[PDB]
Amino acid sequence: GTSNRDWWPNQLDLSILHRHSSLSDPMGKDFNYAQAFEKLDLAAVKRDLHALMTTSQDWWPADFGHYGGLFIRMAWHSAGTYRTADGRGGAGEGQQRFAPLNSWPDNANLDKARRLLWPIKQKYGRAISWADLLILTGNVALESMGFKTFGFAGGRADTWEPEDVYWGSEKIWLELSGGPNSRYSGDRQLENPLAAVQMGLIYVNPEGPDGNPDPVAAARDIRDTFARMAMNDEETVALIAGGHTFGKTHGAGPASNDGAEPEAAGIEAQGLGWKSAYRTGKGADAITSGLEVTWTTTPTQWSHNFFENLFGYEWELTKSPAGAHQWVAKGADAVIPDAFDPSKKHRPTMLTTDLSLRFDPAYEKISRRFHENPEQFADAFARAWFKLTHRDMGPRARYLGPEVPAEVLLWQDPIPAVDHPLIDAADAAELKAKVLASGLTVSQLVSTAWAAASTFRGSDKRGGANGARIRLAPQKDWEANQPEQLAAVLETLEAIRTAFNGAQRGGKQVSLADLIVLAGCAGVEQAAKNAGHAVTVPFAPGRADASQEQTDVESMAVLEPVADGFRNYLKGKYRVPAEVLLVDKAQLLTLSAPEMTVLLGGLRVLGANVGQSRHGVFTAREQALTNDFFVNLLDMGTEWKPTAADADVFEGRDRATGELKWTGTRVDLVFGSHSQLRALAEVYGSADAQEKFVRDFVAVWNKVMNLDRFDLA
Amino acid sequence: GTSNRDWWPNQLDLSILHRHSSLSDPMGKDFNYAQAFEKLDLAAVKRDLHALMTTSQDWWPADFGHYGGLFIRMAWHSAGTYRTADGRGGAGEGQQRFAPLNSWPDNANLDKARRLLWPIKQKYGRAISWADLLILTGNVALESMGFKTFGFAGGRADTWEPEDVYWGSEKIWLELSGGPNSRYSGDRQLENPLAAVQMGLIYVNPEGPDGNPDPVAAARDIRDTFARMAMNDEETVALIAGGHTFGKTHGAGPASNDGAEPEAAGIEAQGLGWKSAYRTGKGADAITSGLEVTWTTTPTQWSHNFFENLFGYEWELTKSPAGAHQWVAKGADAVIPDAFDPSKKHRPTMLTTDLSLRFDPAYEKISRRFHENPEQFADAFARAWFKLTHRDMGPRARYLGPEVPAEVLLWQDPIPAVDHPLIDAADAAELKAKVLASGLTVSQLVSTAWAAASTFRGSDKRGGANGARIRLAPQKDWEANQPEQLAAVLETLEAIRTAFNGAQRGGKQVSLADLIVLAGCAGVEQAAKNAGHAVTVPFAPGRADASQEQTDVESMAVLEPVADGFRNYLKGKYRVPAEVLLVDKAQLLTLSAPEMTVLLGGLRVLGANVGQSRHGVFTAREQALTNDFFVNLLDMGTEWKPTAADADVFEGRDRATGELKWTGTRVDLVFGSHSQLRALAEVYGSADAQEKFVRDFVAVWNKVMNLDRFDLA
Numbered sequence A, B: 001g002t003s004n005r006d007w008w009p010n011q012l013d014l015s016i017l018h019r020h021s022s023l024s025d026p027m028g029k030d031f032n033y034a035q036a037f038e039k040l041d042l043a044a045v046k047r048d049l050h051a052l053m054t055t056s057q058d059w060w061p062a063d064f065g066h067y068g069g070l071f072i073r074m075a076w077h078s079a080g081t082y083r084t085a086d087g088r089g090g091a092g093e094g095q096q097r098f099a100p101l102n103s104w105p106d107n108a109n110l111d112k113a114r115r116l117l118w119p120i121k122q123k124y125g126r127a128i129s130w131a132d133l134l135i136l137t138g139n140v141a142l143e144s145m146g147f148k149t150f151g152f153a154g155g156r157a158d159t160w161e162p163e164d165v166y167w168g169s170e171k172i173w174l175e176l177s178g179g180p181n182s183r184y185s186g187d188r189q190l191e192n193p194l195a196a197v198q199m200g201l202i203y204v205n206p207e208g209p210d211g212n213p214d215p216v217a218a219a220r221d222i223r224d225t226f227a228r229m230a231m232n233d234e235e236t237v238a239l240i241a242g243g244h245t246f247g248k249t250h251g252a253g254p255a256s257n258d259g260a261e262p263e264a265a266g267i268e269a270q271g272l273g274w275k276s277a278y279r280t281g282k283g284a285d286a287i288t289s290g291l292e293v294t295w296t297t298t299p300t301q302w303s304h305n306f307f308e309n310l311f312g313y314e315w316e317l318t319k320s321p322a323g324a325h326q327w328v329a330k331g332a333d334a335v336i337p338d339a340f341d342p343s344k345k346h347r348p349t350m351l352t353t354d355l356s357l358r359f360d361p362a363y364e365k366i367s368r369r370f371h372e373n374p375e376q377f378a379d380a381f382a383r384a385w386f387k388l389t390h391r392d393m394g395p396r397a398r399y400l401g402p403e404v405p406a407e408v409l410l411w412q413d414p415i416p417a418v419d420h421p422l423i424d425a426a427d428a429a430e431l432k433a434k435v436l437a438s439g440l441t442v443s444q445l446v447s448t449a450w451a452a453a454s455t456f457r458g459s460d461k462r463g464g465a466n467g468a469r470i471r472l473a474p475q476k477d478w479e480a481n482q483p484e485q486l487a488a489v490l491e492t493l494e495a496i497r498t499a500f501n502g503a504q505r506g507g508k509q510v511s512l513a514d515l516i517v518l519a520g521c522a523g524v525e526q527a528a529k530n531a532g533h534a535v536t537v538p539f540a541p542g543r544a545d546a547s548q549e550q551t552d553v554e555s556m557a558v559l560e561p562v563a564d565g566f567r568n569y570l571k572g573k574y575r576v577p578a579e580v581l582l583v584d585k586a587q588l589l590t591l592s593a594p595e596m597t598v599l600l601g602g603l604r605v606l607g608a609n610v611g612q613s614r615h616g617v618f619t620a621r622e623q624a625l626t627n628d629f630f631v632n633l634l635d636m637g638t639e640w641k642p643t644a645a646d647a648d649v650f651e652g653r654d655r656a657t658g659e660l661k662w663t664g665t666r667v668d669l670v671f672g673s674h675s676q677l678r679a680l681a682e683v684y685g686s687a688d689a690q691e692k693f694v695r696d697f698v699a700v701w702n703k704v705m706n707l708d709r710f711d712l713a
Ligand code: HEM
Pocket: A063, A068, A069, A070, A071, A072, A073, A076, A203, A204, A205, A206, A222, A239, A240, A242, A243, A244, A246, A247, A248, A249, A250, A251, A287, A288, A289, A290, A291, A353
């Protein structure tokens, strides 16, 4: 059946903005997962999970009698897709049960693990999400085997369809680098926003880079991919060694024995894949990756035997039964247990990527410290496992249940508690009046608040106006934020704040985070007044100010907007057309196409553009909140042509006279070109739309201001 | 950017069920287009449209000074995509402004017509939809040029994204037959559900079949495509000759002069396409189809000149300036006006497809009759133009405004007015009790009501339980309806009705249409009681019974379900897998994926299957309303394999014992396989979901029973 994407494969795709509708959701419109989870008996779930660890099912028998290693793998893969570049992937939406992740080669046989969990999911129903249960299962596995975890938070609501994520451009699973759609260039530079070395892998190739079994060069890929998932060298060593303290790999014969991945399998498979023709197809004959490695002498118990072995033996290169490269300790006795036959024992083995922890000189220092001090290893691994499995859950205000760790970690971008009465409606009105009397303009007010709020991304729920981090390094110096103009605005707002707070009795005080947002509200209200309309923009106090010491500057770097179409801003020149980058930003801001449309057309005429650019400012009444952007953009009396200077900037000229009326970028003009976006712009550009434009603008403005306000959930 | 469609190009696509969400819609959730239109001043709009007809714009100068012909073509193409096979296409959603229809070759330069209407759309805003306006404009054109129309109804609400329609499998615009994805086979048999001869054409090729200029063979294509758009020979001749009484074609030089169609054009084109390098690119130099034909001596006025010319001259095959085949009148004087130069005149010309109306023996009889009796032609063309432009609008209850024709036409599938008091709540309870006392089973009651209601399709709003057409030819004889079982149920219900109605005072009476639905309600209530739940099913009276004479049996044939997954029914063997046909049916019923899921799992256990098949009946308590289908389908204790006798029927056996537990079809098992549908089934199959399943079932049951109830809208 030929489709629009076939005829026009380079057109912009807006359906990414309308995923997750109420249509696709089986839960009623008022279902609140946090309410449901809060009443779950978590300890009962964990008791059922403990029992499951050693209750083997004949259709996928448990290695060593214990599913713990499988389930730790399952949870590491659930969380391991996460990229810090855009916040996409991670465990927070339970996407491992959807395409494509459910059928990634690195997720082979995790379909069995998820099926083992169905009886418990079924038992507890809507009170525990699949997303939460994958992580919780991993924790219970660790606990069951003697490892004390750092805690657990619930609150990952289930999703009901695949997320739209760029995982690469390769059309072949697992394609080696350097092909026609290579994700590498230069000196092994991986393209942003990717965080894995090959299509369908979680991070790296266990045999080594593109299959070359060189531990030293494998360590380079490890470090780069793990960094791209927000983990440093200590956390990386802890996580790899910690995970490999348990269970085994599966390669009992040749890989090709496996059948079709779950999305390609027959209907009779009922959602399972990789059906194997090798012997029984399962248990002792299981084939997953094609490697056949067991790391420790007690694969079902926490130990310090991974580093005892790694350092205690010299390693030689060998091949698994499927022909994959792996390593063996030949001088060793057969001390490692067999998964099914009590009369069989085996020599220690390792992956190339395990040896990376000993043969990369930076990793070796850490590994040795963890070898000599296994309590330090246990603590680092507990903290890194928590971070891994929670990194995309957002502000601590979202964490549910009885096991949440009380320690506040720097990576959580923490927000201090508020311990004082908040401003009321009358106070908010008094502050808006003071802000407007200071001389700050509508442009200044709206630009500042947009810059503070518009760092949010819904992918990992980082960013937003809470914290007043716009005043701190590095946000205060980001070029998008216009640092000298920003410094002048903040100085004036901070004097307003000091004055207001100094006049209060009884503990009442306003944060700078709240004031920056309220001041943006006052700018919007004044722009509405400039256009002849009285509106009240909603405002919800309770944001707090974070310190520079509570702000990891390096981790903040990924939130810098290098393209923000809402401010007509492009930091440099990109491969991807600017309109594509607009829709990507809209998705991260959780906007629909209509909301993206209204918001951009208001921002244009409010003076939100970086540098006071005239591009897209299609109004003779700037700083008034009107629908002039749309009226002017859609006027057929104006003809548009790309400039000689720059093919991405366009001149709009009177069609009859040739007089220059306007200039725009691709972000501006796409609203007059793309057939769906132009249909939207026509609604807002109609004669009957002045009231709707203003109302819908204020609503989306408010939505953006509140994106991180999980304290008000 | 690789997507799920790329990796698994044959997987089932559910996003067709969640189009048209509140996400994509710019209007607020309570916007009611009918209310808005009802307050439009239609007379004012029509005066602005009359004015526009001769207000020539320089960027697309009007032929002969009058845009009428252009706008009649525009309207005829808006309506001309309609297929009776599935009800998809047509003018009722204004889809001409979206991909792909906005860029179909046959819609070349209709992007200019639509842009000429922007100032009017903008003026009236939300009170007139683009969908209604394209039709209205056509009507005004006709009127402006002297032709009295039969009427106009408003009420086509706009849509905000492309509809999902199978338009063919060809990967090349306009590909001639017999290619790798040929839409023809056999003795020029066009594949259902298609109604055009080439990809990107409305009906037929104006040069003749696959470009061969044979009027007699062209007539065959005309007759077949037009029949597939619900028009007979009389209506076809009246429409073709009526339309070609006006305007002209455009082929002033070679076609290749045209540039990119609108979805491929640069951003600076602002939504327009087919930019021509030939001379001025417009007006006297316009190039649309590549044909250069003007049919009459007065192309801006209604006349009788089309038939005068067609019969009055002998025709010679010639070539347009672009090399297309067309016809010129032998030995004629230059009597046809030039569109721009008052000093130039032209000989009469015709398309191959115009000559079809003279050289096909059936058409020639009609054409001669219209030639000899031009009042008969005028009336037929008015009626056929109304039908063309209204055929997908649904029941007359949807028609808005002051120009709706009072005459009821057979093609509208008319429903008689109700002229008596309706049954109230006490009466409905009394009738449900009598239904249940008669001995009618849950299975009978539910199957009958599903058969009556489930004929509805939202594409053209035909079908549904209003009318009691299930008792009439041909519905009563459809295989899916189980004709012998159906006749026994209707006999019993009709004695109930006669008795009830006989006992009433006043004019109170119940229709059989209402009773069939009320009886289904009672069976659902009894099934809930059988399961231990106390459930009342909503019911809305007011359906009326249509007569056999108000029911065109041939036009009804396209509503026969040849595939109905909800009854586990497939009439024959088809190319498209049964799960695909399930989702297609869901879409026509306007169901989301969750509603499709709940409804099928309930229907299975209520005994709605055709022939009392056990396929998918995964319960030990048939005729009780429970969530057993889901619980049992998701039980990993059961293993599924395709049968030896039939690869599309499956046996589910105990994994441990081998005992046969169930049998299922692909429609059944897809809910256990497809990753998104299995996610849905898991919600309904959970321990906490029995009450949610019952509730959700009753809601969707009721939605289906009310799909045609535009009298209640
Ligand atoms: C360089 C990074 C890593 C590499 C290349 C990697 C590689 C692999 C491979 C190839 C397998 C075998 C799959 C099979 O054949 O069954 C596996 C198993 C496993 N991995 Fe990793 N691993 C990495 C990091 C992690 C981390 C961070 C964790 C958890 C903290 C994890 C925990 C496990 C567990 C528990 C198993 C055993 C599965 C079972 O017993 O069924 N690994 N690893």
